[PDB]
A paper describes a structure:
Human calcium-sensing receptor ([name]) is a G-protein-coupled receptor (GPCR) that senses small fluctuations of extracellular levels of Ca2+ ions in the blood. It maintains Ca2+ homeostasis by the modulation of parathyroid hormone (PTH) secretion from parathyroid cells and the regulation of Ca2+ reabsorption by the kidney. Like most class C GPCRs, [name] functions as a disulphide-linked homodimer. In this study, we have determined the cryo-EM structures of [name] in the fully inactive and agonist+PAM bound states.
To obtain the structure of the receptor in the agonist+PAM bound state, we collected a dataset of detergent solubilized full-length [name] in the presence of PAM cinacalcet, 10 mM calcium and the compound TNCA. We have observed two active conformations with overall resolutions of 2.99 Å and 3.43 Å. The agonist+PAM bound structure of [name] displays a substantial compaction compared to the inactive structure, including the reduction of length, height, and width. Moreover, their width changed most obviously because there are four interfaces with interaction between the two protomers at each of LB1 domain, LB2 domain, CRD, and 7TM domains, both VFT modules adopt closed–closed conformation, and the TNCA and Ca2+ ion composite is bound at the interdomain cleft between LB1 domain and LB2 domain. The cryo-EM map of active state presents a distinct density at the ligand-binding cleft of each protomer, which enabled us to unambiguously model TNCA. Two sites were previously reported, while a new Ca2+-binding site was found at the interdomain cleft of the VFT module that is close to the hinge loop and abuts the TNCA binding site, and interacts with both LB1 and LB2 domains to facilitate ECD closure. The bound Ca2+ ion is primarily coordinated with side chains of D190 and E297, carbonyl oxygen atoms of P188 backbone, and hydroxyl groups of S170 and Y489. Our CaSRagonist+PAM structure shows that TNCA and a newly identified Ca2+ ion bind at the interdomain cleft of the VFT module, and they both interact with both LB1 and LB2 domains to facilitate ECD closure, therefore forming the closed state of the ligand-binding domain required for [name] activation. The agonist+PAM bound structure shows a TM6–TM6 interface, contacting at the apex of TM6 helices, which is a hallmark of GPCR activation. In the agonist+PAM bound state, the loop of ECL2 is pulled up by the interaction among E759, W590, and K601, leading to the movement of ECL2, which would raise the reorientation of TM5 and TM6 domains during the activation of [name].
Author numbering:
A (entry chain A): 22 to 360, 392 to 708, 722 to 861
B (entry chain B): 22 to 124, 128 to 360, 392 to 708, 722 to 861
Write the structure that this text describes.
Amino acid sequence: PDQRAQKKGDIILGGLFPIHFGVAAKDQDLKSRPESVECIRYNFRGFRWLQAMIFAIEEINSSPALLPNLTLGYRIFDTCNTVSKALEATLSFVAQNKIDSLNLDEFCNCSEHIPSTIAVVGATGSGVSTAVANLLGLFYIPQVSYASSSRLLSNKNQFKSFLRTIPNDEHQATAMADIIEYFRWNWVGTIAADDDYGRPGIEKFREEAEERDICIDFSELISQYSDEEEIQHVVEVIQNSTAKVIVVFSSGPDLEPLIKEIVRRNITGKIWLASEAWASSSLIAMPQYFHVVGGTIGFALKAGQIPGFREFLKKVHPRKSVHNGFAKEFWEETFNCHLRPLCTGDENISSVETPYIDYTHLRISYNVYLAVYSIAHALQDIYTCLPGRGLFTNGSCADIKKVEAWQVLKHLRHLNFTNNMGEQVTFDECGDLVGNYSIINWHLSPEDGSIVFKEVGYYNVYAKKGERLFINEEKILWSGFSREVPFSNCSRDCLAGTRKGIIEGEPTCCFECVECPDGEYSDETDASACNKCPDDFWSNENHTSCIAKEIEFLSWTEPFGIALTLFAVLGIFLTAFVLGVFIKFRNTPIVKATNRELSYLLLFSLLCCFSSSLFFIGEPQDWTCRLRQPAFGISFVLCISCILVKTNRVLLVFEANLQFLLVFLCTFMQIVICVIWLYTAPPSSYRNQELEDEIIFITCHEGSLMALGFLIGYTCLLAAICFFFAFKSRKLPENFNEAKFITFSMLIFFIVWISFIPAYASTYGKFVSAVEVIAILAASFGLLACIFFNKIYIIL
Amino acid sequence: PDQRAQKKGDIILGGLFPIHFGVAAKDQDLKSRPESVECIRYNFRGFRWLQAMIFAIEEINSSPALLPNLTLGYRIFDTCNTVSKALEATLSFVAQNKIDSLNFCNCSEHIPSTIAVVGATGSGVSTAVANLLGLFYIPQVSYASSSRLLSNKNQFKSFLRTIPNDEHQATAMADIIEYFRWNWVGTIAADDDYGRPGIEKFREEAEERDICIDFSELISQYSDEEEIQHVVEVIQNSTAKVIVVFSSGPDLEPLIKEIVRRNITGKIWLASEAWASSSLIAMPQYFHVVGGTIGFALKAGQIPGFREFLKKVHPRKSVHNGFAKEFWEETFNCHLRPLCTGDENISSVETPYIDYTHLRISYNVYLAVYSIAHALQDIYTCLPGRGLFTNGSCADIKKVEAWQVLKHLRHLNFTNNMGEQVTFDECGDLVGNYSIINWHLSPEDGSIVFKEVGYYNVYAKKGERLFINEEKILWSGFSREVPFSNCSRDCLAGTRKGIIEGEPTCCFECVECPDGEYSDETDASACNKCPDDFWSNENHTSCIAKEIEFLSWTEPFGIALTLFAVLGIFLTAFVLGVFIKFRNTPIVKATNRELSYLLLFSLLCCFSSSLFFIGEPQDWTCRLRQPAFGISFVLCISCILVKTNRVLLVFEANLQFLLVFLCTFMQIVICVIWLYTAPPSSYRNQELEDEIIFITCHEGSLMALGFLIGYTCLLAAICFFFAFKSRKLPENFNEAKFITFSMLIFFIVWISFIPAYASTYGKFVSAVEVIAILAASFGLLACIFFNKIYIIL
Ligand SMILES: O=C(O)[C@@H]1Cc2c([nH]c3ccccc23)CN1
Ligand SMILES: O=C(O)[C@@H]1Cc2c([nH]c3ccccc23)CN1
Ligand SMILES: *[C@@H]1O[C@H](CO)[C@@H](O)[C@H](O)[C@H]1NC(C)=O
Ligand SMILES: *[C@@H]1O[C@H](CO)[C@@H](O)[C@H](O)[C@H]1NC(C)=O
Ligand SMILES: *[C@@H]1O[C@H](CO)[C@@H](O)[C@H](O)[C@H]1NC(C)=O
Ligand SMILES: *[C@@H]1O[C@H](CO)[C@@H](O)[C@H](O)[C@H]1NC(C)=O
Ligand SMILES: [Ca+2]
Ligand SMILES: [Ca+2]
Ligand SMILES: [Ca+2]
Ligand SMILES: [Ca+2]
Ligand SMILES: [Ca+2]
Ligand SMILES: [Ca+2]
């Protein structure tokens, strides 16, 4: 390495910064002796970090309070983000230690003029720094990095002298998961880089997503040296996916070919998530690409303050700066000339617009500044060590004249001081720091069309999980110009009345919506299953909620019921035209039956025949006391018996007072059978019919219907017997044709049941009570009309 | 590095082998100057590999057909599975190139420079060594590094290997998992460069093949007790019986010991190639925890004369090999506490150094050494004018450089002692077959043995690369039944799936298919919808056909209707069939025999129409039952109604015979007009009454039938009005009274069956209609002919 930044001093430090983005991308066939690689691109941020470190060292050497008489030198080389260059620089650093503490088999002699460094500033990448630390751990030389946040460097078993001044990015995955949870999504992507920074950083994110039940569509890995095949495959995978959110864990140059290919293919409508590595890189954030990476949300560190730095940055000159060997190359790259046209030392560094001269926040430079002062404070603590109170064995103390690397590492292990801003800086036993992570968004400046970063929130690491992040949605512009929150889900959420259904070969986050069948209802949206038991209710047409069932039965409240009751009471009134108001019964001339008894009985007999029809009307169980367990046969057992005794009285004169006792004996069998039935045998009722539809049915199904059939058959047989007995003498019309019309009156009763048997068998709306009551009422009207034909001839 | 194996020569080769499994674990507080670490336990497999390399070098140096005038030396250090120890050896190897490349430094010229370095046994150690060796373009060949991270040529330029990569092993394990009926498995990996890269591919394959993973954990050799306890608790609190392990011997040893201490059984263990045959875990005392373990092994090789060279090791005569002094002490438990002598036997003590059945890593080392020798021979034997360098130039064997050796090694193709061809790929990788082994218990020795139960191919198409013999696999060491490892039992027939919240797709519930649809396959995603003409079974297994009821003639009610119809036909033919004498008969008032056969055939046609009314609407394709609706209401009644018309005409006052056919004319023309206006159709839908399909008839403009019935009723009413004043007096065989009584019977029959028409049992409207028609016709014929059938003549 001919180019170097070397300054002499009593104590020598080591530094490694990236000045070039990469090396020549050429393959060697090894046909001849290989040569060293050559740089292709130039970096300006590394020069800024180098200048900041030089300024910090100079301020240390210019502060008598920090160090009275100690002068510190430095040796800085270039890495170019290459493992080989950093390994060569580290080997050159540890040559004095290598010749002495190593290679004991053979005698190795070297010049004493070369100095020995006490510490080496770590590299930027997480892979190069890993190799540098692995090689440095043999000699116990401390190494402090400023940009490595990989977890693989946190293992103290493999690395013993590695420290970092950048907060660990393990909380970055948690913050991204919380961001995804806040803007509720379930379909996301995953793109990482094949290195030591991307692969370990995606496992934690995937674990957090799985813990939060977040589905991942595709996961891909990219690299800077990959050719067109992998880039095309990744582009095809991205295009063939419906995920609108992509998580990217990569660097600037690593992601540059993918961004260029996407821009060439004009792929838009995607959301880009940026980590701290590439949230502010100038290689990706360009106006020409603003239509592909617009509205990008990224992570950034906490800004620092370095007084007297802007003025120092303008003092660089390629002629009066002999200590710095990179000034000439920086000048040539900035002014784009040779030292084609000749260039003198009379330009202005602030004319050309380059990132070296303009900046908004110093994060990595502040990290290097803090590391340099941490080393200075460790040296000061070594100098100020008091006898009798030390960190070595038996209370020993070190000598400032002869300081070894292991003593510096031991003193750096237990370090605590105050920052220039009043903060407290100390090193944890894992060699890691804790700091805030900030959220930034990309916007377009209307003035000159330049990409700018705006703060729209922050992440806290000193609070309990759940409320560690704050965000302001009103200041976030999605896709660069859109304000509404984009919709990125595998499928639409199920609405009310629909349930979920599995699709074969698909994850849990993807499903289908299926309408629930009858009898099932669901109120909450996206319900796993619908309620099955409506608690004696019915499912609605839309299955939104439950509906109470309807009770349908014959009642007097309905117009049909009130009309039937009015007809019944009218019939009761029409049989009271003699019962209620009676004509003279003494020496009655119209009827030969002078005696009031056995003839006045027919009045209240017909009254009971009419009144008994009111048992069937209304609900069977409407009243508790009047539950009417016997309902059917009571009407028959009295009315048929009265008809039979009347027919017997009529026939005794023609076919054939002890008659009153004689008529009752024949009908006594009906009454004793009914009394046995209605008391000894307790009838029941059927509460609900077959429980299928929303229309419920109530009915009174008397127990032991065979007894009812038997008693009806007995009554019919007795009626037929009396009809047959009356038939033999009804042909001859005598005595006001009395016997001639009773036969027709009771034949009306017979033909009522003949004409209403299909109504008994089948009825509309389960109204067997209605047909029964109308049949018995019509029979009662017929009997009443044809039983009092003698009164219409003569009033009295 | 005082402990080393050195032999000088014209050409020097480097080598690294693991002689110890690790180093002493102690924290450094930096109170004083740190000292070098020490290795605690000895290893015999690394010593066997070193002996194999020495034997190969000696065989090459004692062969005239290979490098006849060249002498080969070696320089081998110790690694102890430590990164720092290997880095020290790597730095010592590149001491000569340090002055030439870096930066002045003066060094003695007596020290030689190695041209090749044998790769390390580990993965991260090999990566660290190759990172430093790549600067000087020094070729390096490894024998046990199978990590994919070494397959990147951009970072590594002088790395070669003779072992298949881990991608094939992961694919084979995925195929094994897919072969068995398991979908709920675990995952355990080691925090190193061998385990983590070897689990991403396996997880991707499992996700592609629709395989769920229960838990994933990382373990390490230096992990404390808390991590081990957490891993054990996670494993115990799981329902998975199959566990995938990607770790080495010492890495997995603490976890195995902790599991044994807790006496955890009933688990299926899958072993990677790294620990499928390690003696640190395969112990009888742990057998009841690792019984029936399936592991992967490579293809063994044959090295004639190896055992004889192994059985002649001596700590005194082996001046070149300085590692025998410690090996003798370790294998005999002595030192040079009880004093020892150089007269013991090596065969006696049972050690893995001499007790072995196959050689896999040693064969790899032999192949690597022979590949290097073949490259050197090709360098020596190259002819001018056809060299691979620029302008056809060829190198000189007197002065050889590392880059030339690497270039010739990149293009290598030779043959083995077993008649096999060995080449090098563009990435320096090799391919080979795989073997599957199972762990069994010796019946008398009591030790763990390996049995071959199958193999995996790499030269065949996808899906036809694995062969498994189930008749030799013994699960759990003694069990025979195939283990069952599923999240939940599969749904039976007629039962569909149901989702559980916050659970993977591999876990679900079984819910019975509701009524109206069926599923005839197990683990059905959804219940298949039944067809229109089929209904779901009681058990919902499949669909069943429905039934149709149409009052067939074979029905008891149908045959009853038939028997009444034929009885009526016979009774009416008793009068019509026989031509009884009607000469000067006084039964009929009219002398002419006409106006009597009219009724006789009208009743017959009415009976025929009533009989034809029943049956299917489409029983006969010639004509539908439509006339059965019409004529039965006009031909049956109006022709009979002619007698009532003539008798009312007589009461009002061969001349009126033609004047009483008008009613039939108007009724038939109205029927024809209705039929042509909107012919009746047939309704065969289910009408949402029930699941049973019913057949019925529907006609447009149904009010026409009501109007026809109303016209008939009005005609009968006007007949009653006309005959009311004539029926009071009885005369002429009481014909008027009997006709009035017959028509009253007709009215009472028509109005008696009104609620049956309104509602009928079983939707048998046709049965009600035919019953009413027959009853009315029978009463009519029995009552109008009351005096015409009382006496035959
Ligand atoms: O660990 C790593 O590799 C990244 C490197 C990196 C970070 N921030 C940067 C800014 C510019 C350039 C590089 C970086 C943070 N950690
Ligand atoms: O790459 C690695 O780290 C492993 C190391 C290893 C393999 N086979 C072994 C047998 C014994 C000891 C160690 C090993 C295969 N690849
Ligand atoms: C980080 O943000 C929180 C939020 O108030 C707070 O602790 C502080 O302002 C920031 N810095 C540190 C060191 O916490
Ligand atoms: C997307 O799916 C998630 C799954 O939990 C859900 O919470 C979210 O509401 C869905 N998005 C929309 C817009 O409904
Ligand atoms: C376990 O699940 C798999 C998933 O397809 C299935 O093939 C297998 O039959 C199930 N096991 C049993 C015993 O049914
Ligand atoms: C690997 O197995 C296959 C099939 O059994 C066959 O090619 C041969 O036996 C093996 N091949 C090699 C190169 O050993
Ligand atoms: Ca770097
Ligand atoms: Ca970070
Ligand atoms: Ca799938
Ligand atoms: Ca090793
Ligand atoms: Ca392998
Ligand atoms: Ca979960």
